[PDB]
Structure formats: structure tokens, C-alpha cells
Design an enzyme around this catalytic site. Structure first.
Site, PDB file in Angstrom:
ATOM      1  N   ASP D  31      -7.710  39.720  78.522  1.00  0.00           N
ATOM      2  CA  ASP D  31      -7.750  38.681  77.497  1.00  0.00           C
ATOM      3  C   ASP D  31      -7.921  37.365  78.257  1.00  0.00           C
ATOM      4  OD1 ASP D  31      -7.006  36.528  75.833  1.00  0.00           O
ATOM      5  OD2 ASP D  31      -5.516  37.713  74.742  1.00  0.00           O
ATOM      6  N   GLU D 123       5.141  35.862  80.023  1.00  0.00           N
ATOM      7  CA  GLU D 123       4.365  36.016  78.804  1.00  0.00           C
ATOM      8  C   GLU D 123       5.078  37.071  77.963  1.00  0.00           C
ATOM      9  OE1 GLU D 123       1.339  38.588  77.425  1.00  0.00           O
ATOM     10  OE2 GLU D 123       2.910  37.683  76.153  1.00  0.00           O
ATOM     11  N   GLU D 132       8.439  42.465  69.209  1.00  0.00           N
ATOM     12  CA  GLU D 132       8.885  43.034  70.502  1.00  0.00           C
ATOM     13  C   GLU D 132      10.225  42.477  71.006  1.00  0.00           C
ATOM     14  OE1 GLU D 132       5.818  43.388  73.631  1.00  0.00           O
ATOM     15  OE2 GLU D 132       4.291  42.918  72.127  1.00  0.00           O
ATOM     16  N   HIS D 280      -6.124  38.915  72.213  1.00  0.00           N
ATOM     17  CA  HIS D 280      -5.691  40.263  71.851  1.00  0.00           C
ATOM     18  C   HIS D 280      -4.500  40.238  70.857  1.00  0.00           C
ATOM     19  CE1 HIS D 280      -2.390  39.596  74.630  1.00  0.00           C
ATOM     20  NE2 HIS D 280      -1.849  40.719  74.187  1.00  0.00           N
TER      21      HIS D 280
HETATM   22  C1  LIG Z   1       5.281  40.550  75.335  1.00  0.00           C
HETATM   23  N1  LIG Z   1       3.817  40.273  75.432  1.00  0.00           N
HETATM   24  C2  LIG Z   1       2.936  41.305  74.792  1.00  0.00           C
HETATM   25  C3  LIG Z   1       1.477  40.795  74.610  1.00  0.00           C
HETATM   26  N2  LIG Z   1       0.596  41.732  73.757  1.00  0.00           N
HETATM   27  C4  LIG Z   1       0.608  43.175  74.275  1.00  0.00           C
HETATM   28  C5  LIG Z   1      -0.242  44.152  73.385  1.00  0.00           C
HETATM   29  C6  LIG Z   1      -0.073  44.028  71.817  1.00  0.00           C
HETATM   30  C7  LIG Z   1       1.091  44.861  71.167  1.00  0.00           C
HETATM   31  C8  LIG Z   1       1.163  45.016  69.744  1.00  0.00           C
HETATM   32  C9  LIG Z   1       2.185  45.767  69.127  1.00  0.00           C
HETATM   33  C10 LIG Z   1       3.166  46.386  69.947  1.00  0.00           C
HETATM   34  N3  LIG Z   1       4.244  47.170  69.558  1.00  0.00           N
HETATM   35  C11 LIG Z   1       4.919  47.559  70.770  1.00  0.00           C
HETATM   36  C12 LIG Z   1       6.102  48.396  70.798  1.00  0.00           C
HETATM   37  C13 LIG Z   1       6.150  49.588  71.623  1.00  0.00           C
HETATM   38  C14 LIG Z   1       7.294  50.418  71.659  1.00  0.00           C
HETATM   39  C15 LIG Z   1       8.432  50.099  70.880  1.00  0.00           C
HETATM   40  C16 LIG Z   1       8.430  48.941  70.057  1.00  0.00           C
HETATM   41  C17 LIG Z   1       7.274  48.072  70.001  1.00  0.00           C
HETATM   42  O1  LIG Z   1       7.233  46.900  69.191  1.00  0.00           O
HETATM   43  C18 LIG Z   1       8.333  46.254  68.487  1.00  0.00           C
HETATM   44  C19 LIG Z   1       4.211  46.973  71.883  1.00  0.00           C
HETATM   45  F1  LIG Z   1       4.520  47.089  73.209  1.00  0.00           F
HETATM   46  C20 LIG Z   1       3.132  46.254  71.377  1.00  0.00           C
HETATM   47  C21 LIG Z   1       2.097  45.491  72.003  1.00  0.00           C
HETATM   48  C22 LIG Z   1      -0.021  42.503  71.430  1.00  0.00           C
HETATM   49  C23 LIG Z   1       0.933  41.623  72.286  1.00  0.00           C
HETATM   50  N1  LIG Z   2      13.867  43.013  79.264  1.00  0.00           N
HETATM   51  C1  LIG Z   2      12.758  43.182  80.049  1.00  0.00           C
HETATM   52  N2  LIG Z   2      12.922  43.270  81.450  1.00  0.00           N
HETATM   53  C2  LIG Z   2      11.864  43.443  82.287  1.00  0.00           C
HETATM   54  N3  LIG Z   2      10.543  43.548  81.866  1.00  0.00           N
HETATM   55  C3  LIG Z   2      10.430  43.458  80.534  1.00  0.00           C
HETATM   56  C4  LIG Z   2      11.444  43.284  79.601  1.00  0.00           C
HETATM   57  N4  LIG Z   2      10.895  43.250  78.392  1.00  0.00           N
HETATM   58  C5  LIG Z   2       9.608  43.395  78.590  1.00  0.00           C
HETATM   59  N5  LIG Z   2       9.195  43.529  79.904  1.00  0.00           N
HETATM   60  C6  LIG Z   2       7.844  43.645  80.482  1.00  0.00           C
HETATM   61  O1  LIG Z   2       7.161  42.444  80.166  1.00  0.00           O
HETATM   62  C7  LIG Z   2       5.757  42.714  80.216  1.00  0.00           C
HETATM   63  C8  LIG Z   2       5.084  41.966  79.051  1.00  0.00           C
HETATM   64  C9  LIG Z   2       3.667  41.411  79.248  1.00  0.00           C
HETATM   65  N6  LIG Z   2       3.380  40.560  78.021  1.00  0.00           N
HETATM   66  C10 LIG Z   2       3.494  40.486  80.471  1.00  0.00           C
HETATM   67  C11 LIG Z   2       3.005  41.219  81.734  1.00  0.00           C
HETATM   68  C12 LIG Z   2       2.463  40.280  82.833  1.00  0.00           C
HETATM   69  N7  LIG Z   2       3.546  39.276  83.258  1.00  0.00           N
HETATM   70  C13 LIG Z   2       1.196  39.494  82.379  1.00  0.00           C
HETATM   71  O2  LIG Z   2       1.415  38.367  81.907  1.00  0.00           O
HETATM   72  O3  LIG Z   2       0.116  40.105  82.542  1.00  0.00           O
HETATM   73  C14 LIG Z   2       5.582  44.267  80.213  1.00  0.00           C
HETATM   74  O4  LIG Z   2       5.072  44.765  81.465  1.00  0.00           O
HETATM   75  C15 LIG Z   2       7.000  44.792  79.940  1.00  0.00           C
HETATM   76  O5  LIG Z   2       7.357  46.089  80.426  1.00  0.00           O
END
Ligand SMILES: CNCCN1CCC(c2ccc3[nH]c(-c4ccccc4OC)c(F)c3c2)CC1
Ligand SMILES: Nc1ncnc2c1ncn2[C@@H]1O[C@H](C[C@@H](N)CC[C@H](N)C(=O)O)[C@@H](O)[C@H]1O
Ligand SMILES: CNCCN1CCC(c2ccc3[nH]c(-c4ccccc4OC)c(F)c3c2)CC1
Ligand SMILES: CNCCN1CCC(c2ccc3[nH]c(-c4ccccc4OC)c(F)c3c2)CC1
Ligand SMILES: CNCCN1CCC(c2ccc3[nH]c(-c4ccccc4OC)c(F)c3c2)CC1
Ligand SMILES: Nc1ncnc2c1ncn2[C@@H]1O[C@H](C[C@@H](N)CC[C@H](N)C(=O)O)[C@@H](O)[C@H]1O
Ligand SMILES: Nc1ncnc2c1ncn2[C@@H]1O[C@H](C[C@@H](N)CC[C@H](N)C(=O)O)[C@@H](O)[C@H]1O
Ligand SMILES: Nc1ncnc2c1ncn2[C@@H]1O[C@H](C[C@@H](N)CC[C@H](N)C(=O)O)[C@@H](O)[C@H]1O
Lengths: 343, 343, 343, 343
Positions: D31, D123, D132, D280
Site C-alpha cells: 500500500d 501502524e 482490531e 488497503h
Molecule cells: C493494525 N493495522 C492493520 C492494517 N490493515 C491490515 C489488513 C486489513 C484487515 C481487515 C480486517 C481484519 N480483521 C482481522 C482480524 C483477524 C483475526 C481476529 C480478529 C480480527 O479483527 C478484529 C485482521 F487482522 C484484519 C486486517 C485492513 C487494516
Molecule cells: N499487542 C501486540 N503486540 C505485538 N504486535 C502486535 C500487537 N498487536 C498487533 N501486533 C502486530 O502489529 C502488526 C500490525 C501492522 N499494521 C503493522 C506492521 C508493520 N509495523 C508495518 O507497518 O508494515 C502485525 O504484524 C501484528 O501481528
């Protein structure tokens, strides 16, 4: 001589053997853009030749010397190092120009001319302009040039522009990945895969393409043949900063070149640009092992460094970075050993 | 050494430079008929390799040595003169065979083996079998062979047969007649037309063809590698007397070759015959500059003389006559400079 | 219970959550080939249902129990573990079949039936037939089956065949080569390329394809549900020997399955073969990280091993070689994480 | 820990399993708006990093820590709870930054840092910003922040605006009307139609849209990460009063979010607004159960209430009314189960 000091024997032997074939001379002669532009440049600047003394560096079949004769030159020394010199002589006699064109067999670095000349003409351009290192012999020949004598061609411009061409990239990439397979007839090659990718991407790609694949306006590097010295061409450093006009993968740089014959009456250009009709030089593309992603409006900057070698060619170093991401790409290409893709 | 004495330094540089490219090794590896038949010949004669000492003359990537390993050899000395020797070493490590395959950089004429071997393997065949003169290096290597040691391949057959091909014949002139013009940009080229004709006819033509163009059953010339000496290949005289199966204009002789691996369990043949699937050797045709008319049942007799030169190739002399008419043709070609015509 | 024993309660949560959505039930119901074939199998074998006692394992919306009711069953126990059981009950009442269809909420491994049944019906098939491991619950239910009771479906055939599909291979390969780049925003990722290529190629690919890509006749593996035990499905070994019908690159194996309902009146087949109209199962392809080359007439042999895991799926092991060259491929796949490519 | 207490372990398993895939890290990395803006924010505020101690919460591949390293940080603790931590460590070594980036496997709520840090980067944004519940882990990490330490990003704005989209609203019933048929292969399904409708409406819709469906300037809700406590995010009440700029049927609320990196040198914004290039995160839409007619100039007021749940997401309550008309609607949505509608 200056020539043998800069040239491996086994290279020089292949080189003049190649130009000894009538079929290769014919291949250049038949490039109509090439041959007809030289003739126009010479005939339309006839005052630059009328009653003049001319030197033709690497006369091949003799064809440029006959143009100088058509333009009225008084005397033309046509120097040629391959056995093609003997065929040139035959043509000079059968064309009844023995009184004006004098073939002199040998390397222009090693022969003796009887007198200084008013103008030097040559077609010394290789792929990417510099391949073959014949431009140095052309410059070397200025030792015979009278003060304020001219050179035809007078200047050369090399152009570089970034391009995108996934199909070319994948094509070379697929080639290298033969050496990725773990079980070729039961044998694991995969340990050589890196060395394979290096070898394939070392090859500049010779052929033409649509200008649509270019992602920025070309940068230009100019050699002025009136002024340059042989040693200027031993190490050629071409800095560049492209302003990206399109988003996408940058797969490498494309090169082409123009030369200008700056005569007293007019300046005539010979171009090998992809916007122009195709010549036997085509164009040349150096690929990156790892293409750069850029967005319209980014600047792509770096250096193309050409280092002359004793195989009558250049080791090419290209370093490029997308300034906005710091994504950097480094490549070295062996110009002597191009991949001729054109079909 | 024996090698440096029969070979101009400059030819050798170019030669081993060429085999230094992974892409060229790849080109041979990918010839599936070539590579798969070597593997079959070795694996199906596994008793000839099981716990044996093996010499691989010119191992390239190492591929044949790995086949010897797969068949159970105890020790394999893989000799290679180009920088490909370094890549072969890499493969031997990554394939965990350092205990059994020993790479030895250098010319087989110049290196030292620690011990005599039970069997020599090699793929030393050029165009027309003999081109490159690597067969001599293979024969030379017998200085390392134990008494009653074997050679894989064991024999080679060169085949010759007369062909008719009006289109190939006339092509030569259509090309040379480029020079037959009184005013190419004003120059009369025509005096060089005979030389251009000579030049094309001196080139053997590499490609394949439909066997229907063949006019008589082939004649066979055999080299037994167990028996031959290096010097036998300096001057190869191949007499022939074809009994014409067809009436027409004979335009030349076509050449191809087979080798046999005569193993303890079976004999395997590798053939480059036009009746067989294509290999990267194609076939080779040497034109007569004057065709010869033979009617069916006539005999076409003469000699094909190959004289080795220091460019790692042969000067080819072909003399032929139709006994019934006495009309004669005689031609010289340079096998070092074939015309690659296949597309 | 036998179910919680073999399943991570975690996995089972998500699994029955998924089937709790009306939209997912709707998705199966709308597969007309699937639903219409079940209905045909049941209605055309009405003697197998008329006045019978029936168990429907995993009834979902209830749809198959209604078909059993239409064919005249006396009593149908419709067992369902997700909250969809409640909606099924609603449909039973609104269709006035409370006297004949009895919904029983719960896992079939954990509920109690009041009596033994004449016939079990179910649609327990996942991707590649085995995914989801519901076939084990179907077999487990035989504890309620009267001696000589029937099963609908009665048998399942899994088909495997080798395929070539360079576009899919490259698509997947191009994804993994993201981790090949040396300077992604100035960061060298290239250490992770092996692991990226491992991850992407573990994913079975779900979608359909032209049968033109299949390189040999399929091999068939049969599970007879009348006879099989739950434990038979824990480790499924499928040996194969393909006689290649086409030369080219084998990029992996393609899988699909048929089931047969072997009734008293007729046998009806439900096929998910690529020669048949598309179902919501599509087909499944397991890719090799590097294709095997093969020639028509070669045999490609090896084993596909499926090992059940507690995520209600299988770890897939595929080992294959080209017998003629000893060229070998070993791959491990993760059926619980397929790439749904269809669009 | 704080993490375990607020999270069902099976949600956690599923969550960190998801981020354990290189393909998912890749998806965020690619992204370009996301990744390029983080890099710009960090590099253009290099004084905020030069010789600083940094915490990266949830480092994933490590990408942000490498940016911190490029900006001159002295030491970076990169904490990561999924198995991605092992791949990040590999990258740290292959990029020769083992002296500056220290990977710490585990939940930021459960690990020990050796020292306090100058700045936390992360992030942590999900759909609608809050999904999340990683923002709470980000806030929780402030326990390691030195007094007057900074946070990158520093604030987040959630935006809400009413939209009209007659096609999107009607599509719910069109899908649910699958159930409204009296004889689906013999079964009356119609009794489930209302439940189907309720089910679709519980799902927030993920895709983008033309900004012309928006009926009012967005209302903004701001979280200042320097100030907020974990607890502030357990129950987020967002009142709204839209001043309608357009007359028509309001079918729901659209959500997007911006974050700001407020650095010493400049403030950089990352936006996911529909007026900006797609990320994304797309955008998110929640439907009202019944549309509300509003005139431009009217006011649409109510509340969006987000209640955190142990599935790492939120139950969303939206109540809205047209103030001038009294007309009212609401909906209850489950953010864990969004409907992905983009193509
Ligand atoms: C923190 N930065 C993330 C950035 N970006 C990553 C990809 C996208 C995304 C959208 C919905 C999702 N549900 C769960 C999930 C998977 C397992 C259990 C509970 C869940 O959601 C409450 C995710 F990981 C997850 C990630 C959109 C956001
Ligand atoms: N409590 C937590 N402790 C450690 N890692 C976490 C926790 N919650 C979420 N993550 C991680 O945070 C990341 C979320 C991503 N949005 C960021 C990844 C990376 N820093 C990037 O910006 O590309 C994932 O790899 C998760 O597994
Ligand atoms: C000077 N005008 C040339 C015009 N035109 C002639 C035909 C083409 C061409 C392309 C590559 C080449 N490599 C060598 C070579 C052959 C042997 C040894 C070293 C070599 O080059 C480094 C050549 F002759 C040569 C000629 C394209 C350019
Ligand atoms: C021995 N096994 C080779 C199998 N196969 C390899 C590829 C083909 C091939 C054809 C012509 C060649 N000339 C020279 C050469 C290059 C430099 C100097 C002199 C040369 O030949 C006289 C070569 F290498 C060479 C290789 C056809 C044969
Ligand atoms: C038995 N009849 C199935 C009919 N049909 C329904 C739709 C399709 C399907 C494909 C993959 C799936 N994984 C899980 C799952 C969900 C949660 C946990 C583990 C899982 O599988 C290993 C599923 F439900 C599921 C359903 C294809 C098959
Ligand atoms: N140092 C050198 N001395 C003499 N001839 C050279 C030298 N280097 C290259 N040549 C010849 O220069 C020619 C290069 C050709 N591109 C030009 C041929 C001819 N001028 C034409 O326009 O057709 C070949 O015939 C070479 O053999
Ligand atoms: N005198 C020599 N000494 C050592 N190697 C040689 C000699 N002559 C040729 N070679 C090598 O022999 C190889 C010939 C190839 N046809 C065989 C390659 C390899 N054995 C294969 O079967 O794929 C090249 O790699 C050459 O460099
Ligand atoms: N162990 C189990 N016990 C009860 N139901 C199960 C079990 N495993 C899977 N199911 C259900 O079986 C159904 C599988 C579907 N493929 C079939 C639904 C329905 N029979 C139809 O044909 O439409 C889903 O509703 C599952 O939740």
C-alpha cells in the site's frame, strides 16, 4: 601503438576479421538511413570538400570516400585495417578514382599519412555510440587534422531514458531461472541461480521498441569530436535525474544516439532514436535485476559510468535511485556482449 | 603443450571465453536429445561406472560427471579449461558430491591427474563432428586411461550424402548480387561481385532440411576413439562414391554424425541425422559452386579432405565428379565460419 | 468427544460460525449442479426412502431432509451443529413437516439419536473432497446405521492429474519475488525470498481451467463410505504413475472429485470434474515451486500424502519424479489456506 | 495481561496467525500511500529520530524500524507478537542493523523493554480506525515512553458522513429475496427471508465509492494518542449533527480516517478519505435499517456508539434522526464481520 596498448590481441583479431567480410560491409551499406544520411551530409556540404584533402577513418568498402570524391575532394586518404582494404582498392580502380582516392592499409594509429588534412570523415559509432571504441581511433586521427579542420560527424549525443517493459524483463528473467531448478536430470543447479541472473542481466538488449514504454524525457550526454581527446573516452560518467512522467516499474534505461555533421552550408543529423526510422544500430536497453517502482512526479537520479576495457568495449555501471523512497538499484553491464533480440 | 601448439592463442581465448558463459552451457544442457541420451548411456551401463575411476574431459557445468556419480562411480576427475570450472565446483558442493567429483581447472593437455582412470567420458563433438578440434583433446586424454579402459562415446560416424536444393544454391547469388549494381549511391559496386560470391560459398551452411533432398545413400566415415591417435585427426581424407538414387542437380554434400557409447550392458547411439529429431548440431551442408548433373544410377565420386588449422577447425576441400560425364566440381570451405541459416 | 479430540475447539468455533450464516447456506443451495443432483439422487431412488428412517448429517438449512421427506421417508433426524439448526427448525414448521423431520442441534459425534436409521444422507465434501474433515463425521455417523443400511453418497473418487500452466506459475511466482527485491524503500528483503516462495506455494489454488492443460489421464483414489472407518482418513496415501501424453512443463497436480449415490433403482453421480459444469467446489491445483520437464511417453510417478490436522484440514505432501531423467519434485501444502483465484 | 484479559484467546490465535503470513505483511507494505507516507513522516522529521531510542509497536516485517534506522535512531525496540518476529530478525541481520534494531517477540503488553524510549512509532489502524483494537496496544505502550516523548502517529481523526446509495440499500433485499420463494426444489424458504435481511444489515460494507453519494460535510472524532488512555477506547461515543448540503434519501453513514504524524520539523498526514487515493483500508459504510428523507439545510443528528468486544473489534450502534422532521432510524452492526464488496 596507441591501439595495441589499449587492445587485447585476441580482441583485435576477431574485430578486423569481422569487418573483413563483404557481407558485413554490405549490412552497413544497406542501412539506408545510415548511408543516405552520410551521403546527404557530405554532398550538401560540398564546399567543405571541394578541392580539399580528406581523411576517411576506417573506410571499409570505401563508400564514404566515394562520397567525398562526389563532393569534389582533391585527395582522400582512406585508411582501413581489415583485409577489406584490398576490396576498397579494387573499387577505386574500377570507378576510375585512383587519382583522388588513396587507400592506406593499416590501423589509423599505426600508418603514416603524407600530409595533414582539411577534414576527417568516419563512421565510428557502435551500439550505444561507444561500443567498439572506434571513436578513440577517430579522435586519435586528429593528429592529422589541420588547424580549424572539420570532423564529419562533428558531435555525438547519447540519450538515456527510463523504460518499462515487463515482457522483456520476464523473458530475460525466465532464462536465468533455468539455474533455479533443484533437480535438472536429478541434479541441483539452484546454487548457481544468482550467478546466472547476473550473467543474463549483464547483457545489453539490442532491438527497437515503442516510445510509449519510455517513462520520462531523455537525458543527453554530448561528445564534441572537434574538442574531445582519446582519453576522455576511457571513463565516461553520465549523471542523470529523470522527472518521472508515468507511474510504474522502471525496468532499466534505454539508450540511443544522434550524430551531427556541422558543415559550412548546413547541419545534418543522423539519428538512431526510437521516434525515428530504424537503423542497423536499433536501440539499446540495460535492464535492472530488480526494477524500481516510481510514481509520476518522482525524480530518478543516479549515474551511468562507462569504463573502457581492452576488449574494445565498456564495462557499464548503472546506479539509480527513486529519490522519494530511497529505493536504489545497482547494475553492471558488459557492452561487448549484447543480446541481439531483434527479430 | 600439445594444445597450445596446435592452437593460436587468440582462438583459444575466444573459445574458452565462449564456454565460460552459463548461457552456452545451458544451451547444450537443454538439448534434450543430447543430454538425455548421455544420461541413458551412462545409467544403463552402470556396471561400467559402479566404483570406477572416471575422467570427464571438458566437464562444463559438470553435468556428465553427475551422471557418472548417479551410476555409482567412486571418483570422477572433471577437467575444465574455461572459468565454467568454478561454477562446476559450486554445483559439486551444493550437490554434496565433493567426496566423489573432483574438479580440475585447466586444459586436459596441461593438467595432472593423480591416477589412471577406468573410463573417459566426454561430449567433444562439434559441427560435422570435427569442428572445434576437441576430439583431439578427448583422444589425448587416453594418456590417463588404464589398459582396456573404455571411452564414452566409443566411436563416431560422420555421414556424407549429396543433396539437391536449388533454393539454397540460388540464395548465394541473390545475396552476392547486392554488389552487381552500377550505381549504388553513385558507386559502381560490380567489380566485387565475384568476391562476394566466393565469400558466401566458403561458408558451410548449418540448419536442417527434409531428407527428400538427399540424392544417394550416405557414405560413412568412422573414428574409433579407443584406437585413434590425435594425429589421425590432423588430415582426414574421406573418399566417396555415391550411387545416385535420384536424377537432378547436385548442389553439394550434406553432413551429419552419430556417436555410439558401447557399454558392457548395451550400446547406446546419439544421432544428429536428418531422419532423427533435431539437436543443437542441426546438420551441415557444403555447397558446390558449380552444381553437377547426375541421372539416377550414375556414380558421383570424389574426396572430401579436412585439414585441421590453428583456429580449432578445418579447411574443407571437396572434389567431385560424375563418372559418366566427367563433369567436375571442386570447392573450399572454412568450417570455422559456418553460415547459421536455421530459423 | 471424538470430535473435540481431533479438532482445536478454536477451529470448530470459526467453522460452525461460518455455517451459521444464511448467506453461506444460500451459497451451497444455489449451486444448482450440487443441489439438483442431490435431489435427483434421492427422488429417483425413492424406494430407498419410502417409509424409512433417515439421518441427515449436518443438515444446514434442512434442504436434504426435505428431499428425503419428498421421497417418502417416515422419519428424518436432521443433525446440525451450527446455529443454522434453529433456522432449519423454522423451515420444518413452516413447511408442515414437524411430524417427519426432527432437527437435533449438536455435533453428530455428541448427540443421541432415539433409534438406528435405514440410511444416512449428507453433503460432507470440501475442497479436494477431504477438506474440513467432515467426511469423518459422516463415517462416524455409521454408528447409527442399521446393518446393510445405505449411505448417500455411497462412494467418493478423488482424481489427480499433472498440469501445465505457466501463467498461473508465474502469477504465483511474481507474488513471491516481491521478497526478492534488494531495496524496497531502501530495505533489502531478499533474505526472505525462500520463505516467501515456500509460503505462496503452500497454498492450493482454487478455480477452474480448460482440460487442455492436463498432461495425462487422471489417477483415481476411491473411498467407499459403506466400508471406510474414520481413522482411514487420518493419513491418506495416494501413489500415482502418470503416462505423459504431452511434452512440456509439469507445474503441479490438479485435483477434483466425484461422488456416487448408489441407490436401489439407479446410481447417480455428482462430479466436480473440469470437463463438467462448474460447481462451487471448482477444482484444486497444487503447484510445484519448480516445474518438472517431461516428454510424451515418460512416466511421472510419486505420492500424494494427506495428513489430517486439528484445523479440520490436511497437510499435503507431494513427491513426484520424471522416471526417465530422475528429475524430482517435493512439495508441502496447506489445504487450510487455499488461494481462491476464481473470478 | 491487559491484552489477554480483553481478548478471547481464540481471537488472538486467529489474529496473530493472520499477521504471521508474509503475504499479509506484503499486502500492507505494498500500500504505497500507507508505506510511503510513514517513510516520509519519519525521514522528514529526522531530528525526532537522530540518536533517539525508539519503540516500534507491532513491527511486522520490521519496515518502520528500518525507517527509524534510516532517520538515524540510536536504538529501536521492534516488538512483534506473531511469528513474523522471526522474519523481521532475519531482515535485521541481512541489512546489517543488528547493532541498532532489536527485535522483541511477544505482545507489547507482555514483554519487557530494557529502557524507556523517546518516541513510539506504530501502524495500529484498522477499518474505521478502531477495528482490531490495536490502538489500545499502542496507547498501552506509553508506559515505556519518556516524559514528553512523542508518538508517530500523534492523533487520529475518524470521519462520518451520511450517504445516499439507492443501489447499495436495495441490494440487501435482492440478496435476501433468495429466501422468498415458495418452492425452492419443493421447499418454501420464505419464512427465513426476514433473518436473511437482518443478517446482511448487521455487516458494515467495505469498499470505496464516488464522493458524490455524500450528503454532508463529515463530522470528525479525534483521538490524541499523546493524551488518550487505553480505557478511552473501550466505549467511543461519537455524537453527530450533519448540516445537509444535499436533499435526498440518506441510506447510512460512511466512515474513513486520517492520522497525523506531528513531528518537530513538519506534520505529515496519512488519509484514507474517499477524496484521496485508495488505500488497503478503503472506506466503510453502515446502512440505516430505513432511509431518512432530509432536505439540504436540515439537520441529521444522533450518535454512533462503538463498544469494544473480546473479538478484538466493536459492536456499532448508530441512531439517527432528521431533526426538522422527527423521522428516525438506527442499526446494530458487528464490525468483526464486515462485508467486503470492492472489486
Ligand atoms: C493494525 N493495522 C492493520 C492494517 N490493515 C491490515 C489488513 C486489513 C484487515 C481487515 C480486517 C481484519 N480483521 C482481522 C482480524 C483477524 C483475526 C481476529 C480478529 C480480527 O479483527 C478484529 C485482521 F487482522 C484484519 C486486517 C485492513 C487494516
Ligand atoms: N499487542 C501486540 N503486540 C505485538 N504486535 C502486535 C500487537 N498487536 C498487533 N501486533 C502486530 O502489529 C502488526 C500490525 C501492522 N499494521 C503493522 C506492521 C508493520 N509495523 C508495518 O507497518 O508494515 C502485525 O504484524 C501484528 O501481528
Ligand atoms: C564502427 N561502426 C560500427 C557500425 N555497426 C556495425 C555492425 C554492428 C556491431 C555490433 C557489435 C559488434 N561487436 C564487434 C566486435 C567484434 C570483435 C571484437 C570486439 C568487438 O566489439 C567490442 C563488432 F565489430 C560489432 C559490430 C553495429 C555497429
Ligand atoms: C564440443 N562440444 C560442443 C557442442 N556444441 C556447442 C555449441 C555449438 C558451437 C558451434 C560453433 C562453434 N564455434 C566455436 C568456436 C569459438 C571460438 C573459437 C573457435 C571456435 O570453433 C572453431 C564454438 F565454441 C562453437 C560451438 C555446436 C556444438
Ligand atoms: C462439507 N460441505 C462443504 C460444502 N462447500 C461449502 C463452501 C466451500 C468451503 C471452502 C473452504 C472452507 N474452509 C472452511 C473452514 C472454516 C472454519 C474452520 C476450518 C475450515 O476448514 C478447514 C469452510 F467451512 C469452508 C467451506 C466449499 C465446500
Ligand atoms: N583503428 C582502426 N584503423 C583502421 N580502420 C579501423 C580501425 N578501427 C576500425 N576500423 C574500420 O572502420 C570500419 C567501421 C565501419 N563502421 C565503417 C565502414 C565505412 N566507413 C562505411 O561507412 O561503410 C571497419 O571497416 C573497420 O575495420
Ligand atoms: N582442451 C580442453 N581442456 C579442457 N576442457 C576443454 C578442452 N576443450 C574443450 N573443453 C571444454 O569442454 C566443454 C565441451 C562441451 N561440449 C561439454 C560440456 C559438458 N560436458 C556437457 O556435456 O554439457 C566446454 O565446457 C569446454 O570449455
Ligand atoms: N460434526 C458435525 N456435526 C453436525 N453438523 C456438522 C458437523 N460438521 C459439519 N456440520 C454441518 O454440515 C453442513 C455441511 C454443508 N456442506 C451441508 C449443508 C446442507 N446439508 C446442504 O446440503 O445444504 C454445515 O451446516 C455444517 O455446519
Amino acid at each position: 601503438s596507441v591501439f595495441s596498448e589499449r587492445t587485447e590481441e585476441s580482441s583485435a583479431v576477431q574485430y578486423f576479421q569481422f569487418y573483413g567480410y563483404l557481407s558485413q560491409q554490405q549490412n552497413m551499406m544497406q542501412d539506408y538511413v545510415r548511408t543516405g544520411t552520410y551521403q546527404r551530409a557530405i554532398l550538401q556540404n560540398h564546399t567543405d570538400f571541394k578541392d580539399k584533402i580528406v581523411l576517411d577513418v576506417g573506410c571499409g568498402s570505401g563508400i564514404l570516400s566515394f562520397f567525398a570524391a562526389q563532393a569534389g575532394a582533391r585527395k582522400i586518404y582512406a585508411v582501413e585495417a581489415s583485409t577489406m582494404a584490398q576490396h576498397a582498392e579494387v573499387l577505386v580502380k574500377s570507378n576510375n578514382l585512383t587519382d583522388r582516392i588513396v587507400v592506406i592499409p593499416g590501423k589509423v594509429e599505426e600508418v603514416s599519412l603524407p600530409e595533414q588534412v582539411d577534414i576527417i570523415i568516419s563512421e565510428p559509432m557502435g551500439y550505444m555510440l561507444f561500443n567498439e571504441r572506434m571513436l578513440e581511433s577517430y579522435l586519435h586521427a586528429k593528429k592529422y587534422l589541420k588547424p580549424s579542420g572539420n570532423m564529419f560527424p562533428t558531435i555525438g549525443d547519447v540519450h538515456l531514458a527510463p523504460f518499462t517493459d515487463e515482457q522483456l524483463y520476464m523473458e530475460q528473467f525466465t532464462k536465468a531461472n533455468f539455474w533455479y531448478q533443484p533437480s535438472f536430470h536429478g541434479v541441483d543447479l539452484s546454487a548457481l541461480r544468482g550467478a546466472a541472473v547476473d550473467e543474463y542481466f549483464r547483457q545489453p538488449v539490442v532491438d527497437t521498441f515503442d516510445i510509449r514504454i519510455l517513462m520520462a524525457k531523455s537525458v543527453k550526454y554530448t561528445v564534441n569530436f572537434l574538442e574531445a581527446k582519446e582519453g576522455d573516452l576511457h571513463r565516461i560518467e553520465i549523471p542523470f535525474k529523470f522527472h518521472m512522467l508515468h507511474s510504474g516499474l522502471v525496468h532499466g534505461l534505454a539508450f540511443w544516439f544522434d550524430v551531427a555533421f556541422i558543415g559550412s552550408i548546413m547541419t545534418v543529423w543522423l539519428s538512431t532514436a526510437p521516434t525515428e526510422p530504424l537503423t542497423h544500430w536499433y536501440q539499446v536497453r540495460c535492464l535492472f535485476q530488480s526494477p524500481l517502482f516510481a510514481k509520476a512526479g518522482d525524480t530518478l537520479s543516479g549515474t551511468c559510468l562507462l569504463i573502457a576495457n581492452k576488449r574494445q568495449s565498456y564495462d557499464i555501471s548503472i546506479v539509480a535511485q527513486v529519490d522519494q523512497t530511497g529505493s536504489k538499484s545497482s547494475n553492471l553491464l558488459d557492452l561487448k556482449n549484447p543480446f541481439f533480440r531483434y527479430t
